[PDB]
Amino acid sequence: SELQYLGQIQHILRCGVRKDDRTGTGTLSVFGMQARYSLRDEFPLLTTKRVFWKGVLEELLWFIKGSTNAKELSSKGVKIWDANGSRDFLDSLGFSTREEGDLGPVYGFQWRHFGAEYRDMESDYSGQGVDQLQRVIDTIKTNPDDRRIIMCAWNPRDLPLMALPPCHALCQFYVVNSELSCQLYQRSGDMGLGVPFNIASYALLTYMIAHITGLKPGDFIHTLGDAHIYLNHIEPLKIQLQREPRPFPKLRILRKVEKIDDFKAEDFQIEGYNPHPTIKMEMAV
Amino acid sequence: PVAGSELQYLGQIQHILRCGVRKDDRTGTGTLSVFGMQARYSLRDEFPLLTTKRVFWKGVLEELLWFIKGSTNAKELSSKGVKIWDANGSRDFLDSLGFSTREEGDLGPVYGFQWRHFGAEYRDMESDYSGQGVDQLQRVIDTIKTNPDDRRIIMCAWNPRDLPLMALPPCHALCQFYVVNSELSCQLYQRSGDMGLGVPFNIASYALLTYMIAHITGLKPGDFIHTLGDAHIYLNHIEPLKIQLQREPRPFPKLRILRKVEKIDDFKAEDFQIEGYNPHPTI
Ligand SMILES: Nc1nc2[nH]cc(Cc3ccc(C(=O)Nc4cc(C(=O)O)ccc4C(=O)O)cc3)c2c(=O)[nH]1
Ligand SMILES: O=c1ccn([C@H]2C[C@H](O)[C@@H](COP(=O)(O)O)O2)c(=O)[nH]1
Ligand SMILES: O=c1ccn([C@H]2C[C@H](O)[C@@H](COP(=O)(O)O)O2)c(=O)[nH]1
């Protein structure tokens, strides 16, 4: 359960090697990890530290709508991408002609219009590109034993146009005994700030697709590439590691939804979530 | 001591036999399947060519060189004695997918096309794609030489746009490279792995690729992390694998690169020598 995440934190603190990165700060890094989180009658929202669930829900709906505009997500109260869409950051990447908030062809664009010619964030891409999100839902409805149910956000062609290359680069879905499972490949995971957020993110997505396809949520397999702890996250994570985890909350979908695009934020309710106080961990940039 | 050796593969075989659920697949046969597995194989002064069963090393070497050249022609690999792709390029098979206008052997935009010209408009196997697409294979080599701490060293063969034009969607869809202490490591994401026939072949394949890139970039090979999606054992493979599972593995061989190669395209099959490979008889 949650001990698997805490075990990964401990393993990086005890066996992780020092490795500098692009942000100038240091990390303790381990390459190649895998954890398994059950989705059966529980939702893996971490209890040893309060997780920004409101951000998790809005960002996933922000992904599903295909939006690549940081202002669209920030206006919902979730400012997690405002640093990567700011004028100073876009200029540091050479995007002087882009309006502030244009993250480029990122998660939302690749999920819904993979292969389309990206112009800007306010363009209409209807009918353009590959709709991977609907393709995986239809494949599950008709051929649940398929071993190719993959949604990939890593686009080498669109890569130089992205404000930040996708961290959760590829995910695969798996069905057996009417149970829907999902494995995520995260090329680089910020164990302090991003990883707890990403775990609930793809657990919520599996709950959405299971509800649409009438399946029961199974497991979420979290595979990491460069699993790293930033140096300014060492002391906060040592505090979290000394906390006793509480029971995971449960996720209730309030109404019967037929299409993935009809999900609203008011359709989801987290019950029984009593986390420890939040731990401030600053984003590296 | 287990460590990152062949015992991990045998352990995965045992775990699927004991905890794998029955799951039908696209083929007429069944599988015992487990979703989500990960193993670690050391590349330090040894090469993970499995010893509990003889591995088609000639196929491993020729197929990787066939990928590096950007070829999507099954006949080009078949002419080297490796007929593993001949079924997916046959005339009967191409017609069953709707590719009636394709010459026999045209596998479509597959690994060789996606590794070297990702995003280019695919025509056929005899086309010239010079200057078109993203050369991921050269990009990862350049990134390792100049920015080894980069967390984006990724070569991805999964192309949703080119997917309906492929004779077979990529099983090993994405791999990532990692550098620390002058050691090059590689993690592979395999969406579905045949533990009996494919997985031992794929382990040596990407371990050999790590040896090639380490030789060019002047780094030491480290570990190869094998991540699996649908790790499955075919039902007709259960009894042969139970026999292999009762065998004691022998020490891994060593891979020797005979000459100093500067570019990934200059590697020939005669540049590699496997020494000390003593596998068990085939089952
Ligand atoms: N280095 C580095 N760069 C990154 N770029 C984007 C991410 C992903 C990502 C950022 C932030 C969060 C979060 O939880 N944010 C907040 C939580 C709270 C709260 O818990 O009260 C209040 C405010 C925020 C906020 O950011 O407005 C979650 C995922 C990321 C990373 O993880 N690492
Ligand atoms: O969803 C996300 C977004 C970002 N990050 C973290 C991983 C890295 O610490 C940083 C991205 O930096 P690069 O690996 O691209 O250098 O953000 C995550 O873990 N998950
Ligand atoms: O490099 C490869 C190619 C194929 N396979 C096996 C996995 C599956 O058993 C089958 C492919 O079938 P699909 O997963 O596409 O259904 O071939 C491998 O293990 N490795």
The rounded distance, in Å, linking the Cα atoms of A252 and A254 is 6
CA separation, residue B222 to residues A27, A257, B154, B155 (Å) = 20, 48, 17, 18
| CB contact B279 to A (< 8 Å) | no
| CB contact B119 to A (< 8 Å) | yes
The rounded distance, in Å, linking the Cα atoms of A174 and B114 is 25
Nearest to A150 among B24, B37, B191 (CB): B191
All structural domains of chain B: 1-283 (3.30.572.10)
Contact: B38, A34; criterion CB under 8 Å: yes
Residue A50 alpha carbon, nearest atom of ligand 1: 20
Residue B234 alpha carbon, nearest atom of ligand 3: 9
* C-alpha distance from A255 to closest chain B C-alpha (Å): 30
3-state secondary structure chain A: CHHHHHHHHHHHHHHCEEEECCCCCEEEEEEEEEEEEECCCCCCCCCCCCCCHHHHHHHHHHHHCCCCEHHHHHCCCCCCCCCCCCHHHHHHCCCCCCCCCECCCCHHHHHHHECCCCCCCCCCCCCCCECHHHHHHHHHHHCCCCCCCEEECCCCCCHHHCCCCCCEEEEEEEEECCEEEEEEEEEEEECCCHHHHHHHHHHHHHHHHHHHHCCEEEEEEEEEEEEEEEHHHHHHHHHHHCCCCCCCCEEEECCCCCCHHHCCHHHEEEECCCCCCCCCCCCCC
Q: Which residues on chain B are in Cβ contact (under 8 Å) with A221?
A: 35-36
**Is residue A167 annotated as part of the catalytic site, yes or no?**
yes
Q: Say if residues A111 and A133 touch (Cβ distance below 8 Å).
A: yes
The rounded distance, in Å, linking the Cα atoms of A163 and B5 is 40
In terms of Cα–Cα distance, which of B17, B74, B66, B37 is closest to B199?
B37
CA–centroid distance, residue B220 to ligand 3 (Å): 30
- HSE-CB of A133 using CA atoms within 13 angstroms: 23
In terms of Cα–Cα distance, which of B62, B77, B60 is closest to B125?
B77
The rounded distance, in Å, linking the Cα atoms of A200 and A215 is 19
Nearest C-alpha in B relative to A21: B149
Contact: A187, B229; criterion CB under 8 Å: no
The Cα diameter of chain A in Å comes to: 52
In terms of Cα–Cα distance, which of A1, A8, A2 is closest to A191?
A8
The rounded distance, in Å, linking the Cα atoms of A29 and A31 is 7
CA angle A36, A39, A41 (to 5 degrees): 140
The residue written with tokens 């686009």 in the block is A155
Residues near A158 by Cβ (< 8 Å), separated by ≥ 6? A104, A105, A109, A110, A118
CA–centroid distance, residue A259 to ligand 1 (Å): 29
Nearest to A187 among B35, B136, B151 (CB): B151
CA–centroid distance, residue B85 to ligand 3 (Å): 12
* C-alpha distance from A12 to closest chain B C-alpha (Å): 15
CA separation, residue B34 to residues A173, A181, B19, B194 (Å) = 13, 11, 7, 11
Q: In one letter, which amino acid is B130?
A: S
Residues near B139 by Cβ (< 8 Å), separated by ≥ 6? A156, B155
Contact: B161, A21; criterion CB under 8 Å: no
Q: Say if residues B136 and B123 touch (Cβ distance below 8 Å).
A: no
Residues near A125 by Cβ (< 8 Å), separated by ≥ 6? A66, A109, A112, A113, A116
| CB contact B152 to A (< 8 Å) | yes
CA angle B150, B155, B158 (to 5 degrees): 135
Tokens representing residue B151 in the block:
């967390």
The rounded distance, in Å, linking the Cα atoms of B119 and A52 is 36
Resolution attained, angstroms: 2.5
Return the number of other C-beta atoms located less than 10 Å from residue B170's C-beta.
20
Q: Say if residues A202 and A171 touch (Cβ distance below 8 Å).
A: yes
- Structure determination technique employed: X-ray
| CB contact A178 to B (< 8 Å) | no
Task: Mark which residues 79-118 of A lie under 8 Å from B by CB.
Answer: 114-115
Sequence-distant contacts of B244-249: CB under 8 A, at least 24 apart:
B244/B10, B244/B13, B244/B52, B244/B53, B244/B280, B244/B283, B245/B10, B245/B13, B245/B14, B245/B17, B245/B52, B247/B52, B247/B280, B249/B5, B249/B6, B249/B7, B249/B10, B249/B50, B249/B51, B249/B52
Residue A189 alpha carbon, nearest atom of ligand 2: 19
| CB contact A23 to B (< 8 Å) | no
Return the number of other C-beta atoms located less than 10 Å from residue B208's C-beta.
26
Nearest to A225 among B35, B176, B229 (CB): B176
Q: Say if residues A162 and A151 touch (Cβ distance below 8 Å).
A: no
* C-alpha distance from A155 to closest chain B C-alpha (Å): 8
Residue A196 burial (10 A CB sphere; 0-12, 13-18, 19+): buried
**Chain B contact probe: residue of A27, A223, A230 with most B CBs at under 10 A:** A223
Contact: A174, B225; criterion CB under 8 Å: no
| CB contact A21 to B (< 8 Å) | yes
CA–centroid distance, residue B57 to ligand 1 (Å): 47
The rounded distance, in Å, linking the Cα atoms of A119 and A154 is 18
| CB contact B36 to A (< 8 Å) | yes
Contact: B35, A183; criterion CB under 8 Å: yes
CB pairs under 8 A between A and B: 130
Nearest to B181 among A17, A146, A181 (CB): A17
